[PDB]
Amino acid sequence: GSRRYDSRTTIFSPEGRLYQVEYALESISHAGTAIGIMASDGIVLAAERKVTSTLLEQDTSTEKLYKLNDKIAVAVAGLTADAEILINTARIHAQNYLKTYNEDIPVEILVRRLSDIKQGYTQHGGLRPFGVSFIYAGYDDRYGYQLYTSNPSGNYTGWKAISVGANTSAAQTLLQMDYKDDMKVDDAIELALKTLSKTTDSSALTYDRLEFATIRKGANDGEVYQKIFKPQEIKDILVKTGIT
Amino acid sequence: TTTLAFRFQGGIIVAVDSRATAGNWVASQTVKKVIEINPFLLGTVAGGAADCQFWETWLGSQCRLHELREKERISVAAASKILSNLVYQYKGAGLSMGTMICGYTRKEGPTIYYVDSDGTRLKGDIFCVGSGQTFAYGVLDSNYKWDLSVEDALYLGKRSILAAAHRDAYSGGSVNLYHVTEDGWIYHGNHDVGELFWKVKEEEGSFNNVIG
Amino acid sequence: GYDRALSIFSPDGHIFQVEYALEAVKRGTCAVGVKGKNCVVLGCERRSTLKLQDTRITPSKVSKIDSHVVLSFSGLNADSRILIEKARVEAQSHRLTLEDPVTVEYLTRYVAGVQQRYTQSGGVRPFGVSTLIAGFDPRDDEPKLYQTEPSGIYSSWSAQTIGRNSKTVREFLEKNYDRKEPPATVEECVKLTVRSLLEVVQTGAKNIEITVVKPDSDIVALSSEEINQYVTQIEQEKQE
Amino acid sequence: TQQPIVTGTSVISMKYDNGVIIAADNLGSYGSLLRFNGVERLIPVGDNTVVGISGDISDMQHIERLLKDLVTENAYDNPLADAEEALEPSYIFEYLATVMYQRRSKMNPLWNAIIVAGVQSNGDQFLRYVNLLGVTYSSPTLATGFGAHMANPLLRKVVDRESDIPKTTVQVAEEAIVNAMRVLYYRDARSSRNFSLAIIDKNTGLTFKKNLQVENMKWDFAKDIKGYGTQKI
Amino acid sequence: QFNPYGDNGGTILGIAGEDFAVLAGDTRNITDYSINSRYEPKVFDCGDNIVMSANGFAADGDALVKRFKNSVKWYHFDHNDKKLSINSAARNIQHLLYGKRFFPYYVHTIIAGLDEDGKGAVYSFDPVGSYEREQCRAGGAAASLIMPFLDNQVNFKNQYEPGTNGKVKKPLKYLSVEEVIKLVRDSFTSATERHIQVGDGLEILIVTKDGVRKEFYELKRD
Amino acid sequence: NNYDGDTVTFSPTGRLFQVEYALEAIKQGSVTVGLRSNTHAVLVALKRNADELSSYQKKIIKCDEHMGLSLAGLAPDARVLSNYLRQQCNYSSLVFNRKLAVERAGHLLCDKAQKNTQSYGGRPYGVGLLIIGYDKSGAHLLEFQPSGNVTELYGTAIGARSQGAKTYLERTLDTFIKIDGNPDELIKAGVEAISQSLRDESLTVDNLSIAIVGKDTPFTIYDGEAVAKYI
Amino acid sequence: DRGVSTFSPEGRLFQVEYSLEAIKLGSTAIGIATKEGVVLGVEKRATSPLLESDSIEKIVEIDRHIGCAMSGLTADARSMIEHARTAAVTHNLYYDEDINVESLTQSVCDLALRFGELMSRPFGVALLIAGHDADDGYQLFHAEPSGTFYRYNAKAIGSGSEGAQAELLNEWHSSLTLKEAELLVLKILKQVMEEKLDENNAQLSCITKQDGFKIYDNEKTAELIKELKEKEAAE
Amino acid sequence: MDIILGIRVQDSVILASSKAVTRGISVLKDSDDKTRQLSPHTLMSFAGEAGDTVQFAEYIQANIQLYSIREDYELSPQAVSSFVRQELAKSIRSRRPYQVNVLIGGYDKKKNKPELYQIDYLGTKVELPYGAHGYSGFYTFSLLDHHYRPDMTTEEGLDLLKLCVQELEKRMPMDFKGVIVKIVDKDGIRQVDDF
Ligand SMILES: *[C@@](C)(CO)[C@](*)(O)[C@H](CC(C)C)NC(=O)[C@H](Cc1ccccc1)NC(=O)[C@H](CC(C)C)NC(=O)[C@H](CCc1ccccc1)NC(=O)CN1CCOCC1
Numbered sequence A: 001g002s003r004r005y006d007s008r009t010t011i012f013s014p015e016g017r018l019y020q021v022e023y024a025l026e027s028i029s030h031a032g033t034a035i036g037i038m039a040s041d042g043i044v045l046a047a048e049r050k051v052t053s054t055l056l057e058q059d060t061s062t063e064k065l066y067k068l069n070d071k072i073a074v075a076v077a078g079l080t081a082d083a084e085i086l087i088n089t090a091r092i093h094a095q096n097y098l099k100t101y102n103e104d105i106p107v108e109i110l111v112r113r114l115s116d117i118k119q120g121y122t123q124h125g126g127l128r129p130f131g132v133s134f135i136y137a138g139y140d141d142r143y144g145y146q147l148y149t150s151n152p153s154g155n156y157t158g159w160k161a162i163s164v165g166a167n168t169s170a171a172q173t174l175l176q177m178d179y180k181d182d183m184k185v186d187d188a189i190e191l192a193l194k195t196l197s198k199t200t201d202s203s204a205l206t207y208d209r210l211e212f213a214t215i216r217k218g219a220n221d222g223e224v225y226q227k228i229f230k231p232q233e234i235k236d237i238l239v240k241t242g243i244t
Numbered sequence B: 001t002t003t004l005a006f007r008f009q010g011g012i013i014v015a016v017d018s019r020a021t022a023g024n025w026v027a028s029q030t031v032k033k034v035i036e037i038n039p040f041l042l043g044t045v046a047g048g049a050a051d052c053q054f055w056e057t058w059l060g061s062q063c064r065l066h067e068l069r070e071k072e073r074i075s076v077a078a079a080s081k082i083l084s085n086l087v088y089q090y091k092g093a094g095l096s097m098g099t100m101i102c103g104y105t106r107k108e109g110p111t112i113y114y115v116d117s118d119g120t121r122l123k124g125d126i127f128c129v130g131s132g133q134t135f136a137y138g139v140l141d142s143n144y145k146w147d148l149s150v151e152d153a154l155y156l157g158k159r160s161i162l163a164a165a166h167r168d169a170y171s172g173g174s175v176n177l178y179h180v181t182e183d184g185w186i187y188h189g190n191h192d193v194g195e196l197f198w199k200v201k202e203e204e205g206s207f208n209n210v211i212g
Numbered sequence C: 001g002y003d004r005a006l007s008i009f010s011p012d013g014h015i016f017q018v019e020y021a022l023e024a025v026k027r028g029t030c031a032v033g034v035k036g037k038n039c040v041v042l043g044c045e046r047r048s049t050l051k052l053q054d055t056r057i058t059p060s061k062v063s064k065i066d067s068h069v070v071l072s073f074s075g076l077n078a079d080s081r082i083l084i085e086k087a088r089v090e091a092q093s094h095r096l097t098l099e100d101p102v103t104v105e106y107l108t109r110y111v112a113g114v115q116q117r118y119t120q121s122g123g124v125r126p127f128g129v130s131t132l133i134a135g136f137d138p139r140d141d142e143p144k145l146y147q148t149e150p151s152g153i154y155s156s157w158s159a160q161t162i163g164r165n166s167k168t169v170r171e172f173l174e175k176n177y178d179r180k181e182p183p184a185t186v187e188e189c190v191k192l193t194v195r196s197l198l199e200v201v202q203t204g205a206k207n208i209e210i211t212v213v214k215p216d217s218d219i220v221a222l223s224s225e226e227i228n229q230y231v232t233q234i235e236q237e238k239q240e
Numbered sequence D: 001t002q003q004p005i006v007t008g009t010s011v012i013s014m015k016y017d018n019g020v021i022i023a024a025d026n027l028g029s030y031g032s033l034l035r036f037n038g039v040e041r042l043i044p045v046g047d048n049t050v051v052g053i054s055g056d057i058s059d060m061q062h063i064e065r066l067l068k069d070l071v072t073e074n075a076y077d078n079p080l081a082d083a084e085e086a087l088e089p090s091y092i093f094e095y096l097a098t099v100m101y102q103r104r105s106k107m108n109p110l111w112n113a114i115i116v117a118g119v120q121s122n123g124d125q126f127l128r129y130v131n132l133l134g135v136t137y138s139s140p141t142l143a144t145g146f147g148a149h150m151a152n153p154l155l156r157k158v159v160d161r162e163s164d165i166p167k168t169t170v171q172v173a174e175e176a177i178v179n180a181m182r183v184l185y186y187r188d189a190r191s192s193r194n195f196s197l198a199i200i201d202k203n204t205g206l207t208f209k210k211n212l213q214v215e216n217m218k219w220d221f222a223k224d225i226k227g228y229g230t231q232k233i
Numbered sequence E: 001q002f003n004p005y006g007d008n009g010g011t012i013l014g015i016a017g018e019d020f021a022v023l024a025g026d027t028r029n030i031t032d033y034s035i036n037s038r039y040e041p042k043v044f045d046c047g048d049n050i051v052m053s054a055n056g057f058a059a060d061g062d063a064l065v066k067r068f069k070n071s072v073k074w075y076h077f078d079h080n081d082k083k084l085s086i087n088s089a090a091r092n093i094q095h096l097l098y099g100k101r102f103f104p105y106y107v108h109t110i111i112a113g114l115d116e117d118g119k120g121a122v123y124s125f126d127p128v129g130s131y132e133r134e135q136c137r138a139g140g141a142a143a144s145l146i147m148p149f150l151d152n153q154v155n156f157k158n159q160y161e162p163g164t165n166g167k168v169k170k171p172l173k174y175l176s177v178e179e180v181i182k183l184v185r186d187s188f189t190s191a192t193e194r195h196i197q198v199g200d201g202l203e204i205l206i207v208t209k210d211g212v213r214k215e216f217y218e219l220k221r222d
Numbered sequence F: 001n002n003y004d005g006d007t008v009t010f011s012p013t014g015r016l017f018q019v020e021y022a023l024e025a026i027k028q029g030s031v032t033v034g035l036r037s038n039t040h041a042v043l044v045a046l047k048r049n050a051d052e053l054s055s056y057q058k059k060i061i062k063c064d065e066h067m068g069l070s071l072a073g074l075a076p077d078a079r080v081l082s083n084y085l086r087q088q089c090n091y092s093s094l095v096f097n098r099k100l101a102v103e104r105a106g107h108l109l110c111d112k113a114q115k116n117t118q119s120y121g122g123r124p125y126g127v128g129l130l131i132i133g134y135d136k137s138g139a140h141l142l143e144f145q146p147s148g149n150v151t152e153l154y155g156t157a158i159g160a161r162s163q164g165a166k167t168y169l170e171r172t173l174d175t176f177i178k179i180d181g182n183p184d185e186l187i188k189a190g191v192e193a194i195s196q197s198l199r200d201e202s203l204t205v206d207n208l209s210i211a212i213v214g215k216d217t218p219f220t221i222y223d224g225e226a227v228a229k230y231i
Numbered sequence G: 001d002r003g004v005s006t007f008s009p010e011g012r013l014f015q016v017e018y019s020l021e022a023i024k025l026g027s028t029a030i031g032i033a034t035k036e037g038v039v040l041g042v043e044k045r046a047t048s049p050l051l052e053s054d055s056i057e058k059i060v061e062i063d064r065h066i067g068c069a070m071s072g073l074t075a076d077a078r079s080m081i082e083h084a085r086t087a088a089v090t091h092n093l094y095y096d097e098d099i100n101v102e103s104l105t106q107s108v109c110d111l112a113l114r115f116g117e118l119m120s121r122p123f124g125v126a127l128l129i130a131g132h133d134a135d136d137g138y139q140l141f142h143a144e145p146s147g148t149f150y151r152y153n154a155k156a157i158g159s160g161s162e163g164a165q166a167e168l169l170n171e172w173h174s175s176l177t178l179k180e181a182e183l184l185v186l187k188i189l190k191q192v193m194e195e196k197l198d199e200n201n202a203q204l205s206c207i208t209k210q211d212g213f214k215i216y217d218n219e220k221t222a223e224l225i226k227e228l229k230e231k232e233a234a235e
Numbered sequence H: 001m002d003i004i005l006g007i008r009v010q011d012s013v014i015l016a017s018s019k020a021v022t023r024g025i026s027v028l029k030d031s032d033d034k035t036r037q038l039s040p041h042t043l044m045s046f047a048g049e050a051g052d053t054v055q056f057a058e059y060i061q062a063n064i065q066l067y068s069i070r071e072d073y074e075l076s077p078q079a080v081s082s083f084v085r086q087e088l089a090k091s092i093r094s095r096r097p098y099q100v101n102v103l104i105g106g107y108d109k110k111k112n113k114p115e116l117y118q119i120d121y122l123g124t125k126v127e128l129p130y131g132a133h134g135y136s137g138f139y140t141f142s143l144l145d146h147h148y149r150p151d152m153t154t155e156e157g158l159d160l161l162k163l164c165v166q167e168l169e170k171r172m173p174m175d176f177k178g179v180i181v182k183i184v185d186k187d188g189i190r191q192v193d194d195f
């Protein structure tokens, strides 16, 4: 019958590893680098677009940074199509929580549920896993500013500063070097860009090959604002830090 | 039916009648309305005969499976809740059941739970259930004290059923007595109202309304 | 639905998928359980290749199943969440029907049953997780410590360890733990647990987690400084 | 839940010494309207059974198809289909009785009263009744509808109990049936003069008589009856 | 609107002796004011020395008996030809009846036979499965006529010892098969006189350790 | 070789190897013999044990008062098929008030076994059956094979060394067929037939298993001291 | 790969035959049937000295009149026991009586072959089902994952089964007392066990008509072990 | 099931619930506690159809307790009341709806404020300074309109509550066998034993 053609996506290796999860992570390691940095007064999300073409429409484009709700955003690394499936699920889950409790969803709860969905694809169903790693950046009134990451295994962890995608080894060493706990958002913005600038496979880091976002309490009195940076705004912040 | 069970110093007394009716037709005078679930658990039955019988016989099977699985006798609370959760699933379907789950365990002590077919579940010291419950309440409440002896408590339970058996047209036949202690339930005999009434009348001097 | 029998017997009488799930447990970070005279202590390793972590929000290794029972584990982290969730639901379901919280043996038996079901169900792979379940039964002061594993077998332990380099720490516990006289106090039990992890861990900084469970739903997690005091005390006594 | 539309009236039957007789008129009534006049309500199954059906005609036609299909199904992989493993009256009846009760139990009955008349392989007379409720019974005489009230009394004067069956000939038995049909024509407002009659004998086999008519009727005395009490003209 | 139930009349009667048991029932089958059959048996030998009758709505009665007979057959297949005891049969019948609790078999069921000590046994059931072992039970249309007579003659109710000032009751004792059949025949002739749905014939099934014997008696046909 | 992975695959020569491997399970099974006259039909079965401490595996199963079979191969598969026969015999009784014909019984088993040989996932039955019965057309003996092939016979045998008993019956055909109105002599002929399939072992009291059905004889099984007569 | 319900060229189900190999790796379990009762005994086999041996539950109650001992992948037995207990209690509900030991075993063995492509693989555990009923008296059954069950006068399953079975062949006779059977299980267990037999690493149980199924205490078994050693030294 | 009241004061929420359980012409019990603790600082009283009330209360209690364990965090009274409302809002369009009316009294630890929510069986939620279900409201609302002040203490609230119970005992047709009073504040939930 059909048994002949089954790849058996949800099995263990002799060493106790999940083949498909490992190979999905290998796929993600070639994707554009994404960095998340958490400061005391906000969070930074920076991501490098995959080898841009000059005729690509840059201003009306969304590849890396997506909005889940007013308080939570994600940076993507891997298959974009896969990420969008998961993003719409995450957006719906957030609205279900708001509908049920009349309160915005706590960041971890959203992260856990999305990570549980990924876990399911590794244990049952016989389908391939989602070739996607997220960096979750969000805020709630319990833990404040939070950074998380999830990967195809469905395992998630919390971070002060983290990178996903390509050159994470080199990127994580640089973040570990210059990061400190009493850091501000404007400093974190500078760290994020400097890290990408050194770890990039491109010749020089430019505005058209970047997506950028911040989550500050920079709005008026005790409320959070999400800022998805425009092309011109990235151009300005890149000059202001002295990269171009 | 008339059934009661009350808690006291020396454990629990349980007393029931034995009549079964189909309208005004007296169908039986020898029905067993105390179901022996295990050596430490009793169940009273009032209402639809088949409903009570079938489901309390089923309850005993569920309690047996509990002690096989858990290597421990089921609590009175857990036993009563199995039955109350069962009948609650059938709520609206027309089940007619008025039952009392009486028993002893180490953690609980002597315990009585009233359970009925519309899903009510109540822990308590005294309960009377059935068409003649009010008649039983009248005698039981007016003579009840916590410090009753085992001998006096057994009699009061017997006398309360007799009172209801007399006045309630849909109660009678005979009185079945039980006594529940820390060591388990003890049967205290079947007492035909045919002989018991005249015996009680003469010795007690009560029932002066009746032509002696 | 996906029906494939993934967990099956081999000529030599082994279920390789269950045995490969044990390898995943062997890869996982070390976890240890030691029960004293009036308490149980759950120690857990945290690998130190991960700096820039946020320890406030990162999922803790020890999870409360109910107010009186806790569950730690070794193996796949994502898999453990599914078992913990199921166990937590069953804990509330038990309180609802039996009007009494679960015993530690019952909760273990349930979790172990779930693990077993995934070893002979079509379309699914076994859980790459072994758990240490510890706590105190309702209205009881006798400490309980159980272990489960992917195959579904479970058993009670005076003291036990699972995960990577667990055979080293099990060797330590086997000579240092006395059946006739277990750790009489909380301090003695925690110290023995920390000592056992210090055979394997590396550094006693933010690598060791300790959680103490006591009777009547008295569970508390130790902080860095509190754990560090045990590490400082043990090393000074060692130099002799 | 149904209501019958086009209906058939009485089916009458009885046992005699060597076999059974069954009869039913050829009418398909539509309420008070005597709508259809060429309706055959006796349906032979093989050469040893006749099923007489009253009640709803649409449901009767459904039952015809089932019996027709039953003969076909029995012939499949059956070399003895026209011999030892042929359909018996008892097999045909039990099948119908199973269906009738299953349908009433699903609250969607076949709105009929059925009499299965036949002769078994060992020569024994078979005569049994079944209706929309799945109720079954057997008797030396059986009748449906008005037949139960008027025919049975007349047929029971001939065969009142089991011991009267060997004493009753086919000539006497048929005469009683034909007489009963006349009485029903006098008194049943949903009956017709034309009818069919079937005889299943253990010796001579199945004799199916069509296009019979009620005859030798008494109507002459009507001319003397005037008014409703007083009136002399 | 379609009414799935009907009343086929008739009445049945079970009496238990020391080493025997009888289950009697009239052979008349009716609907409304018409007689369907003067001889339609409704007391059946079901095997394992168990006799059964399900009086009331005949279609449901036949269905039940048919199903219990089948239950006995499969009990042999599944449990190494073990004999189904009368107490086990009774419990099995409870589950058959209660299985249709929300669309009941409209019948009063009685079974008779011998218990595992060899003593006579009669069990009776309501339509939805409540059952009880008794020395004595009448069921069906004329149950209300026959039952109080049985209380008086079988269980000696309201009968005291002469000259004892109503203080000593008439002592209970088992009846002989000859005395029981007298009570059955007198019960049915009395019921035939005063109940229109009872008559035509009486069929008695007697159950001893030797097997199941039958006896038939004529009843008034009006 | 490459065409025996499942039942849904034909070999290049047009063979179904999984069905043939199921047939092989019957040859490993203990011998059982079937034979009939015009009045009676008899099953004789050599039961097998694990060791001296164990019981002897029961080979004969009753399906109805007038029908039953003996098994050879996987016993659980015989239990499934016999249970199916019990239901089909029972369906025929309840619905049509009719004893199921032994020929139809075979047709039903054939069709049930066949469905398992044409579909993916399932497997063929790993057992052979000898069905005897007495119906409206007299005594019958059937041989069921899990390929689906059912065959009506005067006599036969299946299992290990069944060729010996089958040759004997082929010689004795004219004799035993006319054993009418004599149960004990028909059994004797069956016991002598199964004896041609014995090697080193002989027929003992708790080893032999006999069953019989006929004109005025319901299907009954004889084991233990009841078969001591025929040794 | 290959189908789960595939036949080998020899005419056996691959998966059933492989599950039998798993049972040979399991700890030893012995059962002996007498006219005074049936005795069941098992090797606990703790993997480490820190493991509390009293939590090793390889002997199990199904009903008051039926007990069960296991060997092999013991986790697989849980659903088999659950089914057995339900089957036993359910039959008591339907028929107001105890269920036959054979009928109970047959019900358990019906699960065995309900696997394929129902559960994904056969059970990797063999069961010794011991009990008593009014008809056939004291009985001992060996239930395999093949769906087959044999009745036994005595039977050993597990790693030391073939050595123990040969010993049971010589020692068993139809007039064994219960006390003699108890000692015989302990004797044979001590012979095939790796570690030295004591009350902590071995467990005894029995089923009698009077007292029903009972698992022996470690105090009671310890005395039977001491009684066994003295009797062997006495000649 | 009949009388359930609620009064939110300065620093606490006070719930009073009748003790009587009647069926037919018999008071079966006179010490019934018509409330469940959903979380350490949230209490739900209930009244309505027999069986439904407790079944619903415990089902909610289980769900909230499950949430607390999962997140190691206590839901706010507002969040709990929204969850309860949605469950009743689903229920009303079910095959067989829960016929249960509830009051949810809680103390929000983040806001340091007491909160009282009134939810009927239809899923109709309202936050109130004082609330009641059933015929009780027809007496107590007008009484509280007059005597209630927003800045009252817990002791003043209990006196205000005594005034309601007295009025109900005077004018209500049925004997409800007094009330069990419970207080919800910053220190959790406690029962007034002498009322
Ligand atoms: C006191 C005596 C009255 O409340 C007790 O409560 C006892 C309890 C004992 C028996 C456990 N209750 C009864 O006796 C109970 C009263 C009753 C009747 C019907 C519905 C609810 C309560 N009686 C019964 O259950 C009788 C018992 C028989 C006579 C042994 N059973 C019936 O009345 C049956 C079944 C009723 C039924 C319930 C649910 C669905 C369908 C039917 N009905 C009949 O037998 C019908 N009837 C009898 C008279 O002959 C014509 C047919």
Ligand SMILES: [Mg+2]
Residues within 6 Å of the ligand: B164, B165, B166, B167, B168, B169, B170, B171, B172
């Ligand atoms: Mg009265």
